[PDB]
């Protein structure tokens, strides 16, 4: 249950059209909004942090628990322009944590290639307007149901078994190439799942050992609001009115994460954010949202 | 060239309705309207039409609401038309939208209030639709203003109007009734809620085609849960098997009159327009339920009718939410037996435990580390055991 921040670097327009900078990074846990708000996090990355730093200072430590039998949940919180996709997918020179995770996992596979009778596989889909579509193969809406042991199985979701680092990025690219176009749409969420089946050296080759699962989620642009002029929307509003004020930071995503918001989970959310005053309003709310999470 | 103006306009109008399919060129049409405006500047009606044009320009000025200049046009239009048809409240409502983007809820609210008042001061199809749309917009506002009560009122009004016209779809009505009854639960006005789901139940006579029935059943259960809470106003733990130790008056004429005074409004809420109010009368047989005492058999029966509907949901769900719903139902039936405060009747208490035994197997199924889920189910067994603790 951790919350971290990635403050992005300023762009040409921001430097040309000198916008006053609002976000000030102070240290690992502290940054100041404008308001002069000393927001406190579990880790804050500044405008120049590398992909390796982001991975090594987050996911790498997290993987220590993953390998120990924990399930993980990753929430790339942010708005359009946050750098969320670059952070996860990344560029060739600066590939994101998804790539790095898999490459690191190849290392982890090597670490237990002798030790354990393990196997791995991966899956990946898009959530768009609460609709679920497999991005590893062209499919329709997937059926999220519980399996023979109550696991939240996204029925119809494929499961792949790559070996090389080329496949890692190649397939990550292929998957992101299948995402809905707005440039990737601001309303698209990416959901990956890492399946770690493993069996301890001293345990029987047919010994029942739980599978560790890591969910990687690229959240859609976070950017109380006027509702759409529709009867269905009115019904939804009625439902909202009927609902008790949970007041939690908090969909099909929660269905997907039903058992991944529970115990034995390593949940982490990152707020990739903009430093410019142009986005001041959203930034304030984002940082306060992060406080809701904390 | 007014005829040619409206001619072009109407073409543009159709086009305004039309890989972007709008905005790109819609804006061009916007400007074409301004060109059509040009010629205009009797004349009193011209000015009305001017407001209409500028209104149309405001309407055109959207582009994902980027074109704030429309706001300026609309304000002028208002002034032009305040001297004195219904499209003008549409405009006011549109200004409200703009304020919602600017977060100016109060002014938007004021517009909506006057939109309503005006029509009422006044006293064949557009309005019929628009009017209800307005009520919805108010509900949106009320959400933001937490005017839940007022919103609910409007909700009923829209339900009415949907019923007045052919805005029908059973699933929608189901969830409408569902949330409405929940509202009433939230506001403890159970007595009004009574006809709501049950009215929807009537509607169901004309996928979720069958699967929605569990949602419906859940709500029927909710009735009972709160009806049992009504019974628990004289908390069973605090009283014996007897009741009306409190005032009796369960159907006191006094209360009937009180309820009738309230029913001056609730009967208005009964939107069965005679025909379906007669259907509602068949429903009223169920609505008659208020605060029953020696009716645990009937109470259970009320459950059983919808229990069987519930059992279809046990079928529809793949052994997961089956138990989430069973969980509730077991307690529900057991609570009827809490009300059936007799040492001679504990067989049902056993039967509810038997269902929990059926719900035991799922705890070996759930291999996910759902400790608290599992514990909750263990608590359900504790509860069953508590039935017996009370018997012993
Ligand atoms: N958090 C960031 N870190 C580094 N560079 C960033 C960051 N945010 C924005 N930039 C860069 O500028 C562009 C804006 O990020 P962007 O891709 O728009 O986020 P997204 O596309 O998911 O909305 C990207 O190419 C990104 O690499
Ligand atoms: Mg992206």
Author numbering:
A (entry chain C): 12 to 45, 70 to 217, 223 to 263, 274 to 300, 310 to 353
B (entry chain B): 5 to 22, 32 to 54, 86 to 128, 135 to 173, 200 to 282, 301 to 486
Lines quoted from the article behind this entry:
Kinesin-binding protein (KIFBP), which is mutated in Goldberg-Shprintzen syndrome, binds to and inhibits the catalytic motor heads of 8 of 45 kinesin superfamily members, but the mechanism remains poorly defined. KIFBP interacts directly with the motor head of Kinesin-2 (KIF3A), Kinesin-3 (KIF1A, KIF1B, KIF1C, KIF13B, and KIF14), Kinesin-8 (KIF18A), and Kinesin-12 (KIF15) family members, resulting in inhibition of motor-microtubule binding both in vitro and in cells. We show that KIFBP is a tandem repeat protein constructed of nine helix pairs that assemble into a solenoid-like structure. Collectively, our work describes the molecular mechanism of KIFBP-mediated inhibition of KIF15 and KIF18A via binding to and stabilizing a conformation of the kinesin motor head that is incompatible with microtubule binding.
After characterizing how KIFBP inhibits KIF15 (kinesin-12 family), we next aimed to establish whether KIFBP uses the same mode of inhibition for a kinesin motor from a different kinesin family, KIF18A (kinesin-8 family). In the structure, KIFBP N- and C-terminal domains engage both sides of the motor domain, while KIF18A-α4 is displaced away from the motor into the central cavity of KIFBP. To highlight the similarities between KIFBP engagement of KIF15 and KIF18A, we segmented the motor density from either KIFBP:KIF18A or KIFBP:KIF15. This comparison shows for both motors that (i) α4 is held within the central cleft of KIFBP, (ii) Loop-11 and Loop-12 are extended away from the motor, and (iii) KIFBP-L11 adopts a curved shape as it makes a ~120° turn to follow helix KIFBP-HP4a within the KIFBP cleft. Thus, KIFBP stabilization of kinesin α4 helix away from the motor is a shared mode of kinesin inhibition by KIFBP for KIF18A and KIF15. Second, KIFBP-L14 contacts β4-β5 of KIF15 and KIF18A with amino acid E168 in the KIF15 motor domain (or E161 in KIF18A) positioned to play a key role in this interaction. Third, ɑ4 helices of KIF15 and KIF18A become nestled into a multihelix groove created by KIFBP-HP4a, KIFBP-HP4b, and KIFBP-HP5a. Our cryo-EM structure of KIFBP complexed with the motor domains of both KIF15 and KIF18A supports a prominent role for Loop-1 in motor engagement. Similar to KIF15, the KIFBP-L1m mutant showed a threefold reduction in binding compared to KIFBP-WT. Intriguingly, the KIFBP-L14m mutant showed only a slight 10% reduction in binding to KIF18A compared to KIFBP-WT, in contrast to the 50% decrease in binding to KIF15. We showed that KIFBP uses a similar mode of inhibition for KIF18A, indicating that our proposed model is likely a general mode of kinesin inhibition.
